[PDB]
């Protein structure tokens, strides 16, 4: 399930959702990619 | 043959605006394979592009 393979990666591959500082060009392509394409 | 239609170099006319259009191309292709290596693109739409 998602919940044991989250728990598998973070003890043993070292898995951490590290923070991710975005530009507005990049921050704009992760929203605007989940609605569609044109 | 009293005409004599011939074919040079200089005959091989490109329209004027060429080396403009070409330049603009090129300048939007660049500005995109910039940002494709940036992350704000993906591939797809570099290749689209």
Redesign the interface.
Known sequence: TEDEARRRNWIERGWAPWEEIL?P??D??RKS?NEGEE | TATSISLGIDDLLTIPSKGWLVQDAEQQSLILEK?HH?????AVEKLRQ
Not at chain 2, 38 to 42: A, D, L, Q
């Open positions: 530009t060009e990049a704009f392509a990619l | 940002h940036y992350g704000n693109v993906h």
